[PDB]
């Protein structure tokens with residue numbers, strides 16, 4: 001008889017002994033955030049469909065407008081009518097409501113404050129003094145249970161803990177001067193060193209973003225995207241589920257930082273800023289690195305967004321997980337063949353970055369992320385075709401052979417219907433929502 | 446669950462019975478804001494703003510390793526944790542309810558929002574609507590509402606009877622830190638204007654604001670059943686921040702579709718009346734809207750719009766007849782706030798709106814218990830049949846946003862359920 005699928009069982013079976021799984025050599029150096037394709041001068045500019053060179057997001061805007069006017073939901077993809085095309089872009093735009101400039105990357109700005117002190121919620125609650133009272137719990141085991149319970153309340157579908165590996169913290173962040181208003185932010189970005197010092201609290205000076213040496217841990221969250229919407233990639237509904245999850249990420253960070261602060265510790269939010277989420281997620285045991293470059297998880301595959309919070313709160317690190325992703329990616333290459341920009345390599349892993357956008361010195365499949373970003377204005381969205389076609393993204397990949405769990409190798413061999421089809425709260429799926437149920441035994445051993 | 450709802454659907458028309466005495470209700474009259482009820486003693490006998498007195502009780506409980514009134518926690522650490530979680534939950538809510546219209550998160554226009562500014566070149570909020578068909582709009586906006594975190598969504602024509610006559614708000618340029626000390630009253634009026642607008646004197650809603658979208662935001666059953674203790678305060682708090690994010694997300698979508706939208710959370714008008722008219726559930730003895738999916742263990746928010754929409758049918762699954770014989774909430778209420786008597790048209794005090802047929806409760810008695818217990822009680826929600834220790838909650842079942850996978854299928858939605 002059918003074995004009732006068991007996500008907890010699966011994670012126990014594939015857990016590895018302690019130790020960062022990421023393989024590195026001597027040329028590894030911390031990576032300046034300005035080097036990402038979003039921000040580096042070599043890649044930030046892309047032509048629009050008339051050949052005008054603009055900031056990538058403005059050229060993408062040009063394509064969204066063109067598609068709506070032409071009744072399309074994506075590149076060469078006819079919508080049912082202009083009304084439908086319009087609605088997909090309205091939904092996508094609305095999704096970004098709680099996110100600054102596509103990612104909340106500027107640290108200690110807007111939603112990403114490194115201290116709770118000026119927040120309206122903090123001020124309201126000040127007479128209770130939760131943020132001033134010394135911790136009443138120092139036991140990492142109890143703390144892990146508490147903070148994970150809180151994280152699920154805060155919208156995480158997956159959560160894990162790792163020691164903070166500084167190799168993945170940006171050497172310098174992209175940010176804006178403190179006196180610069182939002183409307184000028186995009187034309188006033190600067191770089192600022194992220195450094196570690198013997199100081200009691202996270203603090204920013206004119207010169208540096210300073211993280212205390214006591215910042216021992218990172219808490220990593222997975223925010224699940226919607227399967228039906230993502231599978232319309234690269235068209236508008238895939239952009240919408242991407243967008244809503246960035247706002248969910250932001251809520252998570254603030255909710256969790258406030259909980260941690262009110263427990264008597266400090267907390268640094270980050271969303272897409274501060275450090276590399278995939279590395280943290282892999283070290284925290286959410287999943288494994290993959291050919292496309294994302295963290296693939298047992299529950300959602302790569303179809304999940306990541307955010308992370310850094311803290312001095314004592315915690316128990318989770319174990320990394322190995323469920324055979326690396327061996328599947330070696331033989332699969334489906335994302336590489338389907339990629340509209342041919343950004344993803346079909347070759348072996350190496351320690352040498354393909355270009356400035358990759359961090360050399362860690363063993364990974366090296367993808368050309370300038371080619372990736374280039375397809376975004378062309379398609380008028382955030383693509384996501386690699387996520388959509390990855391077999392791990394499919395809802396039913398796991399089978400049980402009577403003794404243990406394993407991946408089904410067979411799995412590796414329209415937008416109107418989505419608008420008219422199944423949906424549920426936050427785009428989560430009741431047919432799989434049991435997979436992320438959590439009891440104490442799931443949060444700490 | 447969709448089965449259940451179509452079985453008990455009634456014909457069109459508001460199920461709320463009213464007489465010729467009914468007048469719109471000034472927000473300041475609520476127990477939260479009225480001068481007769483705003484101040485309560487703390488446990489030392491000091492008179493303070495109700496919430497400040499409630500703070501003193503929370504501090505006192507933490508120090509004494511308690512999760513609620515005379516409810517011992519496993520240890521001080523646990524007590525601390527419950528209050529830290531409760532406090533964090535309110536992160537995206539202003540002053541316990543986001544009631545000031547057109548302030549902070551509750552902006553009546555999207556124009557100054559960072560998201561709107563980033564997206565300005567696409568022109569979605571300036572482009573005339575490409576869809577005016579109410580059937581397609583109802584389907585789009587409900588899909589959007591579920592994306593935005595609603596567990597239930599319904600549409601009704603806007604009954605102005607339930608819109609506050611005057612809102613509680615603050616002057617536009619007053620900073621957050623002075624807000625509580627500078628609350629004022631401001632008329633909400635309807636006029637022939639193209640867009641929602643605020644003047645020095647008035648909050649102006651266009652006469653074209655035809656509809657109200659009501660959302661239900663499900664609270665966590667395990668935590669609410671700890672009422673009046675701290676974990677019941679925590680699920681309350683987290684769902685207020687979910688309300689806020691819903692309003693902002695949905696207003697933005699509606700604006701980007703070419704219409705206008707007014708967010709509200711606990712402000713602008715009375716959520717329970719709207720929810721009943723939009724068919725989410727029925728009014729109850731305790732005063733809440735009881736839903737088939739969640740009973741009363743669900744929060745409400747709403748958005749007002751000129752977007753053409755198909756109103757939902759009100760529902761009647763026997764709540765009124767059940768509440769007539771039950772009286773369990775009234776027996777359990779720690780403050781005896783809830784009447785055991787028949788429904789009347791006459792309010793028990795200033796906090797009630799007279800002229801509508803309802804169970805009349807004494808809500809100053811209810812607020813009175815909040816400083817005493819150091820939380821937001823909720824005992825009535827917890828004991829209500831329609832809804833069905835703290836260490837076991839912290840060690841027990843949880844899932845994303847405190848939703849329950851055993852019941853999450855009940856809120857699945859296809860087009861046929863939307864329009």
Ligand code: SF4
Nearest residue numbers: 291329332333335390
């Ligand atoms: S598509 Fe195949 S090769 Fe690409 S990340 Fe998924 S499993 Fe790996």
Ligand code: SF4
Nearest residue numbers: 339372383384385386
């Ligand atoms: S997002 Fe698109 S263009 Fe970029 S790597 Fe994935 S499939 Fe290729």
Ligand code: SF4
Nearest residue numbers: 778811822823824825
């Ligand atoms: S919240 Fe508590 S005090 Fe108020 S009415 Fe309900 S049971 Fe009574």
Ligand code: SF4
Nearest residue numbers: 730768771772774829
């Ligand atoms: S406890 Fe009983 S009387 Fe009170 S609202 Fe629930 S069903 Fe009605």
